Design a protein around this ligand. Structure first.
Ligand SMILES: Cc1cc2nc3c(=O)[nH]c(=O)nc-3n(C[C@H](O)[C@H](O)[C@H](O)COP(=O)(O)OP(=O)(O)OC[C@H]3O[C@@H](n4cnc5c(N)ncnc54)[C@H](O)[C@@H]3O)c2cc1C
Length: 474
C-alpha cells in the first residue's frame, strides 16, 4: 500500500518521458537526491513511440502482456524506461540511505498551491515540495462529431495515447471486421499501417479518412503527401482524403459516419487521431500563466513557471530560439527539456536552446524526420533521389542499435557544413525569404546535425539543389 510522504525535495508531476528524464538528470547531478514522481496512470514511466509502431509488428501473442517489443533489427527492448526494481518505495523515500526515485502510480495531482509549495492528490493526501516539475503532457482531442453523438458512439471510439489504448485497440483489431481511423497525421498514418498489416492476415478492413488531400497534408508538400497516401494504400488501407465528418451515429449495430460530400462510411470501431490538448488543469489552482494561442504552461528560457516550478515536455509552451513561443509533441523535446529541467533544479541555470527533432516510421521501410517550422502552406523546395538499400528505418536501427531515432541522431548541430564539389528519399526545405526555417527528411538518416546547422545559421541559400548534396541527394 504505497503511502505518500508528507514532503519531498523534488516533486515531478506526471510520470512520462519528461519526468523520467528529469529524474535521471537530478540523480546524476545529486547522487543523494530524493525524487518523487506522481503518476495518474497505473504503469511506471514508459516511452510512447513503440505503441503505434514496433509493438504491432510481432508474431508473439505474449507481447501485449510483457510490452517487450522487437526493434526493426530483431533485438528486444522494454517499453519501460528502467526495470521496476531500480525505483524505491514512496514510504522509504524520505530517509532511505543515499535517496532514490519513487513513483506513486494511480494518483493524480488535483491541486497546486504555489505560495504554500504544496499539492493535493485525488485521495486528499497533501505533499509539500522544495522544487517541482510539471510534466503532465497532453490529453487527446476528440472530434466534435463524436462528442455530440452520445455515449454509444463514444464507447466505440479510441483516443490513442497509452498502454491501455494499445491493448484495447489490438484486441478490437482481432475481433471486428472494420476499423476507421480519423486523422491524416503521423500518428493516424502509423496506426493505419500497423492495423492494415494485421488486417491482411485476418482478411479485414481498415479505413483512414481526413480532410486534407493526402496524408500529413498540413506538413508535407503535395508530392510526398500523395506518395505517403499511395504507400498506405499499398498496405491494404482504404484511404479517403477530402473527407469532412458531419456526424457519426449507430445504425443496425454499426457505426455510420456521414461525410459532408455525401459519402457514408459503415465501420465497427473508430480511432480518432486528431491532435493533443496540453494538460493544464493545474494552472487554475496554481495561478500559472497558460498560452491561449499555442496551449501549455508559459515558461521562461530556463523552463521556469515560478522560481521553484519548472515545466517540460508536451505541457510546456517554451520560447523556441528560432520560432518564438511554441509547443511541440516530440519525444526528443520531452527528453531534452526534462533533462534540462533536472539540471536547472540542481543549479545548472542554463537556457533551453535545443532545436527539437521529430521522427515517424511507417513500418521498417519508410521513415521521416522533421525539424523547425514545417507547414505545407509555406513555400517549399523538395529535392529527391532513388533510395539506396540503407535508406530506411530498419537499416538505421541495424546501424545504430536503436529504434528511438532521437537517440541515434544525437542532439547536436554539425560544427561546420561544406557543400561537396522512382524516388524513394529526399529533403524538403521550408522557406521564409530564401532562409530555411524547417526541414523534412524522407528516408535520410544520421544527417539531423546538418539540418540543425542549416536552420540555426539562418543564411539565405541561392541554390538548394547544392545544399541537398549535404544530405547525399544528387
Ligand atoms: C502513440 C504515440 C506515438 C508517438 N510516437 C512518437 C514518435 O515516433 N516520435 C516522436 O518524436 N514523438 C512521438 N510521440 C510523442 C512523444 O511520445 C511525446 O511527445 C512524449 O510522450 C511527451 O512526454 P511527456 O512526459 O511530456 O508527456 P507524457 O509522456 O504524456 O506524460 C505525462 C504523464 O503525466 C500524467 N499526468 C497528467 N496529469 C497528471 C496529474 N495532474 N497528476 C498526475 N499525473 C498526471 C499523464 O497520465 C501521463 O502519464 C508519440 C506519442 C504517442 C502517444
Amino acid at each position: 500500500q504505497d503511502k505518500a510522504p508528507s514532503h519531498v525535495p523534488f516533486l515531478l508531476i506526471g510520470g512520462g518521458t519528461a519526468a523520467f528524464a528529469a529524474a535521471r538528470s537530478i540523480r546524476a547531478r545529486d547522487p543523494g537526491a530524493r525524487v518523487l514522481i506522481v503518476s495518474e496512470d497505473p504503469e511506471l514511466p514508459y516511452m510512447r513511440p513503440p505503441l503505434s509502431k514496433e509493438l504491432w509488428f510481432s508474431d508473439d501473442p505474449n507481447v501485449t502482456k510483457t510490452l517487450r517489443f522487437k526493434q526493426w533489427n530483431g533485438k528486444e527492448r522494454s517499453i519501460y524506461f528502467q526495470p521496476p526494481s531500480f525505483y524505491v518505495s514512496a514510504q522509504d523515500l524520505p530517509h532511505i540511505e543515499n535517496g532514490g526515485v519513487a513513483v506513486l502510480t494511480g494518483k493524480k495531482v488535483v491541486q497546486l498551491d504555489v505560495r504554500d509549495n504544496m499539492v493535493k492528490l485525488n485521495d486528499g493526501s497533501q505533499i509539500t515540495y522544495e522544487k517541482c516539475l510539471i510534466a503532465t503532457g497532453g490529453t487527446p482531442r476528440s472530434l466534435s462529431a463524436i462528442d455530440r453523438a452520445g455515449a454509444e458512439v463514444k464507447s466505440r471510439t479510441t483516443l490513442f495515447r497509452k498502454i491501455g489504448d494499445f491493448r484495447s485497440l489490438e484486441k478490437i483489431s482481432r475481433e471486428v471486421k472494420s476499423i476507421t481511423i480519423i486523422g491524416g497525421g503521423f500518428l493516424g498514418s502509423e496506426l493505419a499501417c500497423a492495423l492494415g498489416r494485421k488486417a491482411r492476415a485476418l482478411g479485414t478492413e481498415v479505413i483512414q479518412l481526413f480532410p486534407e488531400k493526402g496524408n500529413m497534408g498540413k506538413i508535407l508538400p503535395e508530392y510526398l503527401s500523395n506518395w505517403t497516401m499511395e504507400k498506405v494504400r499499398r498496405e491494404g488501407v482504404k484511404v479517403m482524403p477530402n473527407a469532412i465528418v458531419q456526424s457519426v451515429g449507430v445504425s443496425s449495430g454499426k457505426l455510420l459516419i456521414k461525410l459532408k460530400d455525401g459519402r457514408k462510411v459503415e465501420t465497427d470501431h473508430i480511432v480518432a487521431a486528431v491532435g493533443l490538448e496540453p494538460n493544464v488543469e493545474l494552472a487554475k489552482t496554481g495561478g500559472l500563466e497558460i498560452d491561449s494561442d499555442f496551449g501549455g504552461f508559459r515558461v521562461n528560457a530556463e523552463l521556469q513557471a515560478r522560481s521553484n516550478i519548472w515545466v517540460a515536455g508536451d505541457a510546456a509552451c517554451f520560447y523556441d530560439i528560432k520560432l518564438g513561443r511554441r509547443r511541440v509533441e516530440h519525444h526528443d523535446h520531452a527528453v531534452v527539456s526534462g533533462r534540462l529541467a533536472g539540471e536547472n533544479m540542481t543549479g545548472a541555470a542554463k537556457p533551453y536552446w535545443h532545436q527539437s527533432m521529430f521522427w515517424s516510421d511507417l513500418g521498417p521501410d519508410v521513415g521521416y524526420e522533421a525539424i523547425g517550422l514545417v507547414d505545407s502552406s509555406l513555400p517549399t523546395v523538395g529535392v529527391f533521389a532513388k533510395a539506396t538499400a540503407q535508406d530506411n528505418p530498419k537499416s538505421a536501427t541495424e546501424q545504430s542499435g536503436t529504434g528511438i531515432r532521437s537517440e541515434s541522431e544525437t542532439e547536436s548541430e554539425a560544427s561546420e557544413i561544406t557543400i561537396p564539389p522512382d524516388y524513394g528519399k529526399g529533403v524538403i526545405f521550408y522557406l521564409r525569404d530564401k532562409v530555411v526555417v524547417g526541414i523534412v527528411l524522407w528516408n535520410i538518416f544520421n544527417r539531423m546535425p546538418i539540418a540543425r546547422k542549416i536552420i540555426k545559421d539562418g543564411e539565405q541559400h541561392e541554390d538548394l539543389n547544392e545544399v541537398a548534396k549535404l544530405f547525399n541527394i544528387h
